[PDB]
Amino acid sequence: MEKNPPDDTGPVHVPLGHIVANEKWRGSQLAQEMQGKIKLIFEDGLTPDFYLSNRCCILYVTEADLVAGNGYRKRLVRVRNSNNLKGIVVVEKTRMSEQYFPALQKFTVLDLGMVLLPVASQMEASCLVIQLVQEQTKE
């Protein structure tokens, strides 16, 4: 017994509380924060920004996107075209946002009826997402 316990050389207990990040959405300073409290895994082939579960996903949006309106929706359609995934869409208010953010938010709802929780910066999200992930982990 004067020995020491193993150093988890293969903890098959990852399916517990883990978050996925698109290989591309890796070149972000945010994905780093997550590695400050929660575990993060990179997956090459995923479109979403952060995958919490197999039915829940999280996409980041910013005023810049609002300006488009026509084109970015297609990406959202690919999600609803799936099965029954209820993720969350984050929006970063800048300028033309709050101004025309309501017009889009209206349709997006009747269109996807998903969840939209605006923020203000990149931290709010990293803080809004993690703060949520830390709550789920718990029993």
Curated annotation (Swiss-Prot):
Top-level taxon of the source organism: Eukaryota
A single GO molecular function term of this UniProt record: DNA binding
UniProt protein name: Fanconi anemia core complex-associated protein 24
Subunit (UniProt): Belongs to the multisubunit FA complex composed of FANCA, FANCB, FANCC, FANCE, FANCF, FANCG, FANCL/PHF9, FANCM and FAAP24. Interacts with FANCM.
Subcellular location per the Swiss-Prot or TrEMBL entry: Nucleus
GO BP term, pick one: interstrand cross-link repair
GO cellular component, one term: intracellular membrane-bounded organelle
Keywords: DNA damage, DNA repair, DNA-binding, Nucleus
The keyword DNA damage is assigned to this record: yes
Native organism: Homo sapiens (Human)
Summary of the function given for this chain in its UniProt record: Plays a role in DNA repair through recruitment of the FA core complex to damaged DNA. Regulates FANCD2 monoubiquitination upon DNA damage. Induces chromosomal instability as well as hypersensitivity to DNA cross-linking agents, when repressed. Targets FANCM/FAAP24 complex to the DNA, preferentially to single strand DNA.
Entry note about domains: The C-terminal region is distantly related to RuvA domain 2, a DNA-binding domain.
